[PDB]
């Protein structure tokens, strides 16, 4: 949106949100992040955010329900998966 | 030769580029041996 | 003490525009002497050659860059090339090479002006260029450039004599300037018999118009012979600044020997002179 | 016992070398005169092992407007002298808002009061971005870019603004040129030449002895704050915990 079609009104919100993500980590009490995201999502120029908002509300219902699975050893994805899953390189150091 | 040699040392390595080959190199033996007669850069026009 | 760190240590190596001028400044660094040789547009692509003017303007407008003349000289070289219709030739020449880059890449707009050297010998892409003119792997590609500075190095020096004879005075009065007065419409009474300035002026016109409308780059080593003549001319003018008339007897000897030798090579470059070498 | 030593005849040797090319009261004097100058990297060559005290004194004495010159000359120092990186970092935590309030609600002054800020910002991203990435509010930069695209004659501010953004948002090279030629109808070859000119000069040395010649004494109790005295050469004064 900097290469074509300036549109200050929402590019400014986009930068405001990027700085809020970049400078700071999010914790529970996410509702600020949700409201700021939707305040940014006045503009729809990709359908991918329509998936991501669904990826927000799933966490919201999951954020309330953490109390009833307080102890749950759940598997999380490693690094090499996330690269091969996302698309970007690995540089393994020594195999000592 | 040397103005190309330093450009050999930037965009390529120490081994000679393709272009250092093509520039000629005058053999340093082709003088005419003019000092069988001793003259100079004197203006010899006054003589004639 | 000049043992400095070059600019690549301090330049971002993920941009194109600076990293070439890095090589420029570094080539100026490593030479102990001033390269009056152009070997700098040897490195700049034919694309953003127009940045040279802003480069020299930046050199002057700021305080650094202890050298500031050579950035002007290379700019004079480029604007001497655009004075010829020469870069249209070489930009039209590489266009097959831009087609290989067009096809190797999934998306590539066939641009107007190619990001490639002004040399035609620094690279692997020659055999795409050398679908004709196997002279490219013979020295005439080099001497095309080098000879082209010499002419430009001569015109700038000769022309000041034409301004000097135009501004002629009995003090700072020299024999080459007496010959320039002979050509110049404002002529001084003393020694009119030296009409050589025109004779050492029309040769550059022959070369300039010839190179403008040759369009071959496939002759019989013609550019090698547009070089040795230029040495002879630089010798002729240097021995023309003071009294030596007999030394000019071996300068109509030499051009005719030059003519008879290139004619022995059957290089068809022969029409546009040879009443000037006989006058 | 041990503290800073500093010769002065060799300082004059360095003066004649450099300019051939082109108590606390004393510290306040030299801080002021080095500030209100424009040339910096000759003073750094003469006064190397002292300099961080002078940086601290620039940090403390603010004078309510000097801040601009502080970050300006600080940014010019950094690549030559990569050791004042802590104190400058600590400075912006206090001072960032006073620059924001210039850039927000633009000056109605000479543009230079903004020009220097962005310029310093650029260098402090070009030195390292993974530290200075929280002292920026890119929205206000885009606001300035809007206001100076609608208004005319200001075609240098915008250049530095978009250049800062191009290192904040880690852009490539073709987006950069196209972005420029969408907002506009140069820099980076110069700063490298500044650092290269600095590397022309030789290695400075510390005498470590009471030479029989003019010398200047700086002692332990005169090491200002957020900079610590030591037998060798002065070292930064960072961190909170400090109870004796």
XYZ file of C-alpha atoms in Angstrom:
667
model
C 0.000 0.000 0.000
C 3.084 2.247 -0.026
C 3.928 1.140 -3.575
C 0.443 2.123 -4.832
C -2.589 3.892 -3.409
C -1.378 5.793 -0.277
C -4.602 5.972 1.791
C -3.267 7.715 4.920
C -6.391 6.939 6.978
C -5.652 3.201 7.408
C -1.951 2.995 6.581
C -1.484 5.085 9.733
C -3.515 2.605 11.773
C -1.470 -0.209 10.256
C 1.760 1.382 11.411
C 0.265 2.147 14.846
C -0.640 -1.520 15.222
C 2.700 -2.780 13.904
C 4.520 -0.696 16.501
C 2.258 -2.056 19.246
C 3.076 -5.609 18.191
C 6.766 -4.970 17.658
C 7.643 -3.086 20.837
C 5.478 -5.219 23.142
C 4.551 -8.842 23.792
C 0.882 -9.686 24.297
C -0.447 -11.409 27.423
C -3.944 -12.303 28.563
C -5.940 -9.124 28.769
C -5.821 -9.485 24.983
C -9.071 -7.491 24.582
C -7.055 -4.357 23.854
C -5.297 -6.229 21.047
C -8.618 -7.510 19.673
C -10.214 -4.061 19.745
C -7.143 -2.446 18.184
C -7.094 -5.125 15.484
C -10.728 -4.583 14.580
C -10.240 -0.811 14.711
C -7.501 -1.370 12.131
C -9.730 -3.722 10.104
C -11.914 -0.917 8.821
C -9.843 -1.650 5.702
C -10.221 -5.068 4.073
C -7.762 -5.550 1.197
C -6.867 -9.223 1.758
C -9.069 -12.194 2.519
C -6.278 -13.602 4.711
C -7.256 -11.319 7.639
C -10.721 -12.888 7.399
C -8.975 -16.110 8.413
C -6.957 -14.313 11.073
C -9.974 -12.803 12.823
C -11.294 -16.350 13.063
C -7.869 -17.143 14.512
C -8.534 -14.403 17.096
C -11.989 -15.423 18.322
C -10.883 -19.054 18.735
C -8.274 -17.759 21.187
C -10.849 -15.583 22.943
C -13.079 -18.556 23.732
C -9.813 -20.331 24.540
C -8.669 -17.469 26.776
C -11.730 -17.789 29.013
C -11.465 -21.603 29.178
C -7.862 -21.830 30.422
C -9.040 -22.267 34.031
C -10.495 -25.768 33.407
C -7.386 -27.190 31.679
C -4.952 -25.589 34.126
C -2.656 -28.644 33.908
C -2.368 -30.139 30.434
C 0.922 -31.312 28.949
C 0.263 -30.504 25.283
C 2.710 -30.936 22.433
C 3.952 -27.783 20.709
C 5.663 -27.557 17.345
C 9.438 -27.422 17.114
C 11.541 -25.098 14.989
C 12.241 -27.205 11.897
C 8.514 -27.866 11.549
C 7.728 -24.156 11.696
C 10.283 -23.392 9.008
C 9.230 -26.241 6.721
C 5.592 -25.388 7.563
C 5.931 -21.645 6.929
C 8.634 -21.495 4.281
C 12.058 -20.192 5.172
C 15.516 -21.608 5.544
C 17.424 -23.590 8.137
C 21.116 -23.186 8.814
C 21.963 -26.003 11.198
C 25.256 -25.397 12.960
C 27.665 -28.247 13.829
C 26.308 -31.789 14.248
C 28.763 -32.438 17.067
C 48.192 -2.298 -17.604
C 48.117 -1.028 -14.038
C 44.859 0.925 -14.335
C 43.233 -2.384 -15.282
C 45.261 -4.386 -12.759
C 43.650 -2.673 -9.774
C 40.238 -3.410 -11.306
C 41.371 -7.017 -11.454
C 41.765 -6.641 -7.678
C 38.175 -5.461 -6.994
C 35.552 -7.122 -9.194
C 37.731 -10.255 -9.534
C 40.688 -11.886 -7.809
C 44.461 -11.895 -8.272
C 44.389 -14.184 -11.328
C 44.333 -12.253 -14.587
C 40.975 -11.181 -15.980
C 40.060 -11.843 -19.610
C 40.893 -8.239 -20.532
C 44.455 -8.014 -19.177
C 45.334 -10.615 -21.817
C 44.139 -8.624 -24.818
C 45.990 -5.372 -24.077
C 49.274 -5.440 -25.945
C 52.674 -5.350 -24.279
C 55.469 -3.674 -26.198
C 58.727 -5.597 -26.020
C 61.215 -3.211 -24.391
C 63.868 -3.767 -27.084
C 62.481 -1.976 -30.166
C 64.371 1.311 -29.880
C 66.025 2.595 -33.096
C 69.522 3.086 -31.589
C 69.608 6.734 -32.657
C 72.750 7.345 -30.477
C 75.113 6.179 -33.145
C 74.898 9.902 -33.934
C 74.708 12.212 -30.919
C 71.906 14.740 -31.298
C 69.295 16.152 -28.933
C 65.980 18.000 -28.962
C 67.884 21.098 -30.130
C 66.181 23.221 -32.777
C 68.394 22.248 -35.721
C 66.379 24.495 -38.085
C 68.980 27.274 -37.707
C 71.567 25.009 -39.350
C 69.686 24.500 -42.602
C 48.440 8.097 5.862
C 46.598 6.454 2.963
C 46.115 2.846 4.061
C 42.438 3.403 4.650
C 39.513 1.035 5.026
C 37.517 1.093 1.758
C 33.821 1.859 1.640
C 32.535 -1.724 1.352
C 33.266 -2.113 5.063
C 30.748 0.697 5.692
C 28.348 0.348 2.726
C 25.159 -1.755 2.852
C 25.937 -4.682 0.554
C 22.209 -5.208 -0.191
C 21.863 -2.247 -2.584
C 23.156 -1.697 -6.104
C 23.505 2.078 -6.526
C 26.149 2.607 -3.798
C 28.145 -0.614 -4.156
C 29.255 0.330 -7.679
C 30.446 3.760 -6.579
C 32.181 1.920 -3.767
C 34.203 0.133 -6.449
C 34.758 3.498 -8.147
C 36.246 5.167 -5.066
C 38.205 2.010 -4.265
C 39.778 1.874 -7.721
C 40.761 5.504 -7.283
C 42.208 4.537 -3.904
C 44.462 1.632 -4.872
C 46.247 3.435 -7.706
C 49.287 5.405 -6.598
C 48.949 7.543 -9.745
C 45.912 9.345 -11.119
C 44.270 7.024 -13.660
C 43.620 9.351 -16.566
C 42.467 6.073 -18.071
C 38.735 5.657 -17.909
C 38.339 2.325 -16.149
C 35.339 3.487 -14.119
C 32.469 3.379 -16.604
C 34.152 0.018 -17.159
C 32.430 -0.821 -13.851
C 29.264 1.274 -13.889
C 26.346 -0.384 -15.738
C 24.933 1.343 -18.774
C 21.870 1.768 -16.596
C 22.301 4.657 -14.136
C 25.025 6.278 -16.111
C 22.882 9.397 -15.720
C 23.678 9.277 -12.003
C 27.237 10.383 -12.845
C 26.257 14.047 -12.955
C 24.665 13.877 -9.530
C 27.715 11.982 -8.305
C 30.114 14.743 -9.355
C 27.721 17.400 -8.039
C 27.695 15.556 -4.699
C 31.493 15.405 -4.770
C 31.716 19.189 -5.101
C 28.747 20.144 -2.878
C 30.277 18.227 0.052
C 33.751 18.507 1.576
C 35.091 14.938 1.489
C 36.460 13.059 -1.526
C 39.951 14.622 -1.721
C 39.771 13.806 -5.430
C 37.126 15.916 -7.191
C 38.548 16.365 -10.708
C 38.365 12.757 -11.871
C 34.659 12.528 -11.084
C 34.271 15.455 -13.484
C 36.506 13.833 -16.103
C 34.494 10.612 -16.151
C 31.329 12.705 -16.472
C 32.862 14.484 -19.450
C 33.584 11.032 -20.858
C 29.953 9.970 -20.583
C 28.603 13.203 -22.054
C 31.122 12.732 -24.871
C 29.608 9.297 -25.454
C 26.040 10.615 -25.569
C 27.339 13.291 -27.957
C 28.005 10.337 -30.223
C 25.186 7.994 -31.061
C 27.388 5.323 -29.494
C 25.428 4.143 -26.463
C 22.440 3.430 -28.665
C 24.798 1.019 -30.463
C 25.975 -0.830 -27.371
C 22.585 -0.787 -25.678
C 21.207 -2.278 -28.901
C 24.120 -4.732 -28.817
C 23.481 -6.385 -25.439
C 19.719 -6.867 -26.071
C 20.176 -10.593 -26.787
C 21.860 -10.840 -23.383
C 18.846 -9.217 -21.731
C 16.730 -11.905 -23.412
C 18.582 -14.700 -21.635
C 17.948 -12.861 -18.369
C 14.357 -12.398 -19.493
C 13.888 -16.144 -19.944
C 15.903 -17.438 -16.986
C 13.616 -15.511 -14.610
C 9.933 -16.174 -14.011
C 9.125 -12.461 -14.220
C 11.368 -9.987 -16.007
C 10.360 -6.943 -18.021
C 12.589 -6.545 -21.051
C 13.861 -3.108 -20.129
C 15.068 -0.366 -22.435
C 18.586 0.050 -21.042
C 20.525 -2.906 -19.722
C 22.342 -3.308 -16.411
C 25.654 -4.344 -17.926
C 29.149 -2.996 -18.483
C 30.252 -0.578 -21.201
C 33.112 -2.994 -21.982
C 31.831 -6.082 -23.830
C 34.739 -7.921 -22.225
C 34.402 -8.505 -18.488
C 31.985 -11.338 -18.361
C 30.601 -14.707 -19.412
C 27.798 -13.315 -21.612
C 30.124 -12.656 -24.597
C 29.102 -15.732 -26.654
C 25.502 -14.536 -26.529
C 26.846 -11.205 -27.792
C 29.320 -12.803 -30.223
C 26.809 -14.318 -32.607
C 28.739 -12.035 -34.954
C 31.964 -10.054 -34.643
C 34.527 -12.499 -33.237
C 36.742 -9.378 -33.060
C 35.236 -9.038 -29.552
C 37.829 -11.588 -28.364
C 40.536 -9.522 -30.117
C 41.799 -6.290 -28.489
C 39.690 -3.845 -30.546
C 36.918 -3.885 -27.927
C 39.374 -2.504 -25.368
C 40.969 0.040 -27.707
C 37.522 1.264 -28.732
C 37.152 2.724 -25.243
C 40.762 3.733 -24.672
C 41.110 5.463 -28.043
C 37.817 7.199 -27.320
C 39.303 8.955 -24.288
C 42.421 9.999 -26.219
C 40.408 11.864 -28.843
C 38.453 13.436 -26.012
C 41.732 14.083 -24.229
C 43.022 15.802 -27.380
C 40.030 18.001 -28.269
C 39.989 19.507 -24.788
C 43.713 20.289 -25.052
C 43.711 21.419 -28.678
C 40.659 23.639 -28.192
C 42.394 25.698 -25.513
C 45.059 26.575 -28.065
C 42.245 27.804 -30.322
C 41.120 29.944 -27.390
C 44.752 30.931 -26.823
C 45.278 31.960 -30.453
C 41.879 33.659 -30.246
C 43.247 35.413 -27.136
C 46.658 35.582 -28.804
C 49.486 37.723 -27.458
C 53.182 38.206 -28.182
C 53.843 36.995 -24.611
C 52.974 33.328 -24.098
C 53.597 33.068 -27.846
C 54.448 29.589 -29.146
C 54.902 27.902 -32.498
C 51.826 25.688 -32.163
C 49.924 28.890 -31.392
C 51.455 30.500 -34.466
C 50.006 27.593 -36.433
C 46.694 28.119 -34.634
C 46.701 31.767 -35.689
C 47.229 30.427 -39.219
C 43.965 28.488 -38.883
C 42.276 31.107 -36.714
C 40.545 33.985 -38.462
C 42.284 36.342 -36.029
C 45.826 35.878 -37.355
C 49.076 37.426 -36.137
C 51.569 38.813 -38.645
C 54.489 36.675 -37.462
C 55.431 33.452 -39.341
C 52.191 32.686 -41.226
C 53.905 29.682 -42.855
C 52.802 26.949 -40.465
C 49.277 25.853 -41.513
C 49.331 22.694 -39.378
C 46.746 23.372 -36.646
C 43.966 22.654 -39.137
C 45.885 19.561 -40.270
C 46.109 18.374 -36.652
C 42.429 19.319 -36.210
C 40.553 17.710 -39.120
C 41.845 14.248 -38.155
C 39.733 14.333 -35.014
C 36.761 15.266 -37.192
C 37.485 12.286 -39.459
C 37.616 9.988 -36.434
C 34.546 11.525 -34.777
C 32.253 11.322 -37.807
C 33.675 7.922 -38.805
C 33.086 6.381 -35.374
C 29.647 8.012 -35.272
C 28.472 6.290 -38.481
C 30.686 3.209 -38.759
C 28.244 0.997 -36.821
C 30.361 -2.107 -37.521
C 32.587 -3.058 -34.587
C 33.546 -5.851 -37.025
C 36.253 -4.249 -39.158
C 39.794 -5.422 -39.830
C 41.252 -4.265 -36.491
C 40.320 -0.679 -37.386
C 40.164 0.526 -33.776
C 43.754 -0.597 -33.235
C 44.644 1.840 -36.037
C 42.460 4.583 -34.573
C 44.931 4.319 -31.638
C 48.456 4.336 -33.069
C 47.520 7.366 -35.165
C 46.387 9.109 -31.990
C 49.783 8.531 -30.382
C 51.396 10.013 -33.479
C 49.152 13.075 -33.240
C 49.925 13.584 -29.552
C 53.596 13.421 -30.516
C 53.086 15.836 -33.425
C 51.498 18.516 -31.258
C 54.072 18.187 -28.472
C 56.944 18.689 -30.931
C 54.939 21.548 -32.530
C 55.099 23.870 -29.500
C 58.590 25.165 -30.418
C 60.874 25.439 -33.420
C 61.307 22.092 -35.144
C 60.323 22.109 -38.823
C 62.255 19.048 -40.004
C 60.575 16.959 -37.281
C 57.333 17.444 -39.242
C 58.921 15.775 -42.286
C 58.496 12.506 -40.325
C 54.779 13.121 -39.736
C 53.585 13.038 -43.338
C 55.914 10.045 -43.665
C 54.117 8.297 -40.820
C 50.440 8.860 -41.674
C 51.226 7.622 -45.179
C 53.025 4.635 -43.713
C 49.986 4.243 -41.460
C 47.758 4.453 -44.546
C 49.909 2.034 -46.536
C 49.965 -0.414 -43.608
C 46.238 -0.416 -42.865
C 45.684 -0.581 -46.623
C 47.985 -3.610 -46.594
C 45.489 -5.048 -44.089
C 42.645 -4.122 -46.512
C 40.685 -2.421 -43.734
C 37.960 -0.472 -45.547
C 38.355 2.780 -43.613
C 40.172 4.575 -46.351
C 37.839 7.030 -48.142
C 37.386 9.883 -45.617
C 40.960 11.257 -45.712
C 44.121 11.016 -47.858
C 43.855 14.398 -49.339
C 44.310 15.802 -45.808
C 47.364 13.568 -45.280
C 48.709 14.865 -48.640
C 47.806 18.541 -48.254
C 45.055 6.077 43.436
C 45.227 5.473 39.694
C 43.205 7.644 37.332
C 43.231 9.322 33.926
C 46.387 10.859 32.479
C 46.548 13.021 29.371
C 49.470 14.584 27.535
C 49.212 17.862 25.627
C 52.246 18.172 23.353
C 51.032 15.034 21.584
C 47.569 16.599 21.407
C 49.193 19.396 19.415
C 51.036 16.853 17.266
C 47.618 15.401 16.499
C 46.217 18.861 15.771
C 48.912 19.569 13.195
C 48.395 16.093 11.733
C 44.601 16.348 11.489
C 44.145 19.930 10.311
C 46.856 19.381 7.701
C 44.346 17.134 5.931
C 41.300 19.348 5.426
C 38.566 20.214 36.718
C 34.843 20.035 35.863
C 35.000 23.681 34.752
C 37.420 22.722 31.964
C 35.066 19.912 30.986
C 32.076 22.269 30.775
C 34.117 24.681 28.647
C 35.292 22.039 26.191
C 31.833 20.462 26.099
C 30.307 23.784 25.093
C 32.918 24.620 22.479
C 32.844 21.138 20.932
C 29.043 21.253 20.888
C 28.579 24.643 19.242
C 31.148 23.733 16.599
C 30.141 21.742 13.514
C 33.242 19.575 13.133
C 33.387 16.664 15.575
C 35.697 13.914 14.367
C 38.864 15.953 14.872
C 38.020 16.661 18.492
C 37.407 12.933 18.896
C 40.865 12.223 17.500
C 42.546 14.544 19.982
C 40.342 13.806 22.981
C 39.568 10.097 22.828
C 39.906 8.529 26.281
C 38.203 11.528 27.949
C 35.255 11.810 25.589
C 32.589 9.819 27.449
C 32.730 12.304 30.317
C 31.889 14.950 27.736
C 29.028 12.817 26.448
C 27.676 12.570 29.985
C 27.996 16.325 30.391
C 26.023 16.787 27.184
C 23.432 14.429 28.666
C 23.062 16.406 31.895
C 23.235 20.043 30.806
C 20.150 20.299 28.624
C 19.363 24.068 28.495
C 15.744 23.155 27.490
C 16.454 23.178 23.702
C 19.964 21.768 23.182
C 18.562 18.176 22.820
C 18.546 18.480 19.030
C 22.284 19.147 18.902
C 22.822 16.396 21.478
C 21.368 13.606 19.364
C 22.786 15.204 16.201
C 26.428 15.188 17.240
C 25.888 11.897 19.069
C 24.805 10.177 15.864
C 27.821 11.544 13.989
C 30.116 9.985 16.616
C 28.737 6.502 16.789
C 30.163 4.499 13.871
C 33.592 6.037 14.410
C 33.407 5.499 18.166
C 31.171 2.514 18.971
C 31.399 2.932 22.739
C 28.917 5.732 23.540
C 26.161 3.361 22.402
C 25.010 2.775 26.035
C 24.651 6.372 27.175
C 22.853 7.495 24.021
C 20.461 4.579 24.496
C 19.793 5.666 28.072
C 19.285 9.258 26.904
C 16.402 8.535 24.561
C 14.374 6.843 27.325
C 14.070 10.286 28.924
C 14.256 12.474 25.853
C 12.276 10.777 23.026
C 9.037 12.605 23.797
C 10.593 16.050 23.365
C 11.588 15.151 19.800
C 8.180 13.569 19.162
C 6.495 16.818 20.180
C 8.526 18.660 17.540
C 7.769 16.138 14.815
C 4.171 15.882 15.928
C 2.603 19.313 15.362
C 5.364 20.386 12.933
C 7.709 23.166 13.809
C 6.486 26.294 12.057
C 10.230 26.996 12.272
C 13.249 26.265 10.141
C 12.997 22.708 8.832
C 16.502 21.961 10.171
C 15.090 21.387 13.673
C 13.438 18.259 12.238
C 16.099 17.454 9.605
C 18.796 16.677 12.135
C 16.528 14.408 14.194
C 15.622 12.103 11.313
C 19.235 12.127 10.145
C 20.447 10.983 13.541
C 17.618 8.454 13.608
C 18.857 7.021 10.317
C 22.366 6.456 11.604
C 21.087 4.911 14.801
C 19.141 2.402 12.720
C 22.068 1.845 10.380
C 24.411 1.141 13.291
C 22.035 -1.432 14.725
C 18.269 -1.690 14.426
C 17.658 -4.348 17.096
C 18.252 -1.739 19.834
C 16.688 1.443 18.444
C 13.326 0.012 17.396
C 11.114 1.355 20.228
C 12.046 5.061 20.124
C 10.080 5.547 16.877
C 6.404 6.258 16.201
C 6.112 5.625 12.429
C 2.544 6.964 12.265
C 3.786 10.499 12.883
C 6.455 10.073 10.213
C 3.753 9.133 7.729
C 1.743 12.132 8.926
C 4.673 14.411 8.085
C 5.044 12.637 4.741
C 1.379 13.335 3.985
C 1.604 16.982 5.006
C 4.792 17.597 2.981
C 3.445 15.746 -0.048
C 0.391 18.013 -0.018
C 2.622 21.042 0.625
C 5.584 21.748 -1.641
C 9.271 22.741 -1.628
C 10.173 20.173 1.073
C 11.884 17.343 -0.782
C 14.593 16.376 1.726
C 12.589 15.798 4.916
C 10.423 13.258 3.096
C 13.504 11.518 1.706
C 14.904 10.903 5.184
C 11.456 9.989 6.506
C 10.816 7.255 3.966
C 14.451 6.211 4.344
C 13.929 5.681 8.077
C 10.777 3.703 7.325
C 12.683 1.568 4.825
C 14.926 0.347 7.665
C 12.124 0.122 10.228
C 9.969 -2.045 7.945
C 13.064 -3.846 6.478
C 12.139 -3.222 2.846
C 14.071 -4.431 -0.159
C 15.357 -2.328 -3.015
C 12.748 -2.147 -5.779
C 9.909 -1.310 -3.417
C 12.254 1.397 -2.168
C 12.788 3.021 -5.572
C 9.136 2.658 -6.584
C 7.994 4.059 -3.235
C 10.320 7.021 -3.721
C 9.085 7.675 -7.256
C 5.447 7.496 -6.094
C 6.016 10.278 -3.526
C 8.698 12.288 -5.398
C 8.964 13.715 -8.900
C 21.721 11.555 -1.941
C 23.125 10.085 1.287
C 24.664 6.698 1.765
C 27.911 7.112 -0.194
C 28.978 9.933 2.148
C 28.810 8.467 5.665
C 30.946 5.545 4.540
C 33.485 8.098 3.354
C 33.385 9.801 6.763
C 34.262 6.540 8.488
C 36.870 5.734 5.837
C 38.468 9.143 6.334
C 38.607 8.363 10.045
C 40.337 5.044 9.390
C 43.019 6.984 7.487
C 44.366 8.040 10.901
C 46.632 5.976 13.182
C 45.980 4.197 16.473
C 45.792 6.561 19.527
C 47.898 5.385 22.595
C 47.780 5.920 26.448
C 51.153 6.937 28.060
C 50.390 5.182 31.463
C 53.357 7.156 33.050
C 53.980 10.671 34.574
C 56.032 12.065 31.594
C 58.218 15.181 32.357
C 56.104 17.489 30.060
C 52.752 19.420 30.154
C 49.949 16.921 31.168
C 46.246 17.179 32.283
C 44.922 15.234 35.455
C 41.261 13.939 35.654
C 40.654 12.007 38.940
C 38.162 9.515 40.325
C 35.717 11.987 42.019
C 35.400 13.870 38.647
C 33.833 11.046 36.524
C 30.279 12.659 36.402
C 27.362 10.022 36.590
C 26.557 6.874 34.412
C 30.356 6.667 33.590
C 32.793 4.905 36.019
C 36.414 5.770 36.857
C 38.952 2.981 36.490
C 42.737 2.542 36.465
C 42.626 2.415 32.675
C 40.204 4.295 30.465
C 36.709 5.523 31.396
C 33.826 3.035 31.157
C 30.009 3.605 31.067
C 27.706 4.155 34.129
C 24.475 2.126 33.392
C 22.080 -0.064 35.618
C 19.799 0.896 38.616
C 21.167 -1.171 41.602
C 24.014 1.028 43.147
C 23.926 1.260 47.015
C 27.238 1.744 49.016
